[PDB]
């Protein structure tokens, strides 16, 4: 299975951001380096679109961390309740 479209768009956004950042500190040789970096970005986009992965669900990159925190809290609450139950 090809790469998930959400992952492709996320990766493309990160490549755009990093290319803007690496262009910010470049003063001279702007046009040639930006053309080369654009070619690099498009070849990477083609490679990642063509790339194949086994059918494993992989959720959005940004939100997962937050989920973990909530999940952690859930377990804590569960543990607390468990303790209370055992106490009873």
């Amino acid at each position: 299975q090809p790469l998930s479209k959400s992952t492709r768009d996320h990766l493309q956004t990160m490549m755009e951001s990093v290319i803007m950042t690496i262009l910010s500190n470049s003063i001279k040789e702007k046009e040639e380096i930006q053309y080369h970096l654009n070619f690099l970005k498009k070849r990477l986009l083609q490679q990642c679109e063509t790339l194949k992965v086994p059918p494993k669900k992989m959720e959005d990159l940004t939100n997962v961390s937050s989920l973990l925190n909530m999940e952690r809290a859930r377990d804590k609450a569960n543990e607390e309740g468990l303790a209370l139950l055992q106490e009873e």
Binding site: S4, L44, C48, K52, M58, S65, D75, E79
Partner: protein, 66 residues
């Protein structure tokens, strides 16, 4: 997962880009870029790892509380 496959591709692409480029300042910038993105990618891989670990643990304590 998907990242487990795209990171090796990113490593090989970074290697070939570093090999082809000749400017020292551009080499340093590309190296810093690679370090940052590799750190973020391995961080989110770890985050997904404890994500599935926390899912399994949640199921276990669900059975326990039941």
């Amino acid at each position: 997962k998907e990242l487990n496959i795209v990171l090796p591709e990113f490593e090989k692409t970074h290697l070939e880009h570093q090999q082809r480029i000749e400017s020292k300042v551009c080499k340093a910038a590309i190296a810093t870029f690679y370090v940052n993105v590799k750190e973020q990618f391995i961080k989110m891989l770890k985050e997904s790892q404890m994500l599935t670990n926390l899912k399994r643990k949640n199921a276990k304590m669900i059975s326990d509380i039941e």
